[PDB]
């Protein structure tokens, strides 16, 4: 098994909807423990954790220099996508139309 990435993540480019209707976040890893398992979570409008919304199976960083695509299935309305662990976690707001 991989160890959970202990480092920080940043956005490589704008978060966007995919051809199949999911939401893709492409991240650039800033740590030094790759290959490592990406911590991921989703939150509702109130910042409360909601499970089962990660589409990508077992997202990993294999090389710190290579960005990683991560897809989520957010709920309609306001929510957050969170990449990484701790307070340093990359927290992205998302609004899903209709």
């Amino acid at each position, epitope marked *: 098994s991989y160890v959970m990435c202990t480092g920080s993540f940043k956005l490589e480019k704008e978060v*966007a*909807e*995919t*051809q*199949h*209707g*999911t939401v*893709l976040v492409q991240v650039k890893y800033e740590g030094t423990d790759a290959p490592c398992k990406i911590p991921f979570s989703s939150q509702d409008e109130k910042g409360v954790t909601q499970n089962g919304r990660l*589409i*990508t*199976a077992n997202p990993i960083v294999t090389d710190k220099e*290579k960005p990683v*695509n991560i*897809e989520a299935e957010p709920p309609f309305g306001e929510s957050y996508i969170v990449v990484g662990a701790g307070e340093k976690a990359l927290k992205l707001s998302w609004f899903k139309k209709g």
Partner: antibody
Amino acid sequence: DVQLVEPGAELVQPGASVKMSCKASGYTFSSYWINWEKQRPGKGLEWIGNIYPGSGTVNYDDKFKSKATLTIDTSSNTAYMQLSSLTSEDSAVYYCTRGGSHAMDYWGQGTSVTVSS
Amino acid sequence: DIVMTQSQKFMSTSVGDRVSITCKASQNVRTSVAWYQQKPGQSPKALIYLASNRHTGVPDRFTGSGSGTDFTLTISNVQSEDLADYFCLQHWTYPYTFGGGTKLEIKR
């Protein structure tokens, strides 16, 4: 009559690059995604990546990240794919196709790339 | 990445029979599976979308079924124009991946 026209073939020297086109007609170009695929005899079809003409959103299969570049010319309803530093492993039929929530529906005629000196 | 397995590279049939072509996903892809028909020197033609929906113009001989990992393209009353290559595609997540194909041939 939705159509996607690609040139029939391209002969490329080993180490050179190639740029191929996909011209769409019969539908609103900016309302649908474009997919690019690689088909070689003996090997399963591969998805290279996709691009959304209205926004410029682009996604790649990591297997083709160093090889392919997907661009657009929305004023002429055309999608482009550029392949860099070609080897014999790059000889294949390259298809473009219209996409969306229901996946590829209409496929182009394919561009046959031959890598040879 | 998701792997789409078509265990049968070739299948033999007779005109008027039923043939079932299988496609197995390596993970749960729900119903995000399309089926395509391809003849030599021609571009693929879309047959089924979202596992079980028939594209406009496609004969009712063609039906798709399954959800999760096990998908099947069923061709009832096989016609000689149905002799072709058939392949599946998952579009549940990137990268999209295709089955290796199954070629339908005539028994003699």
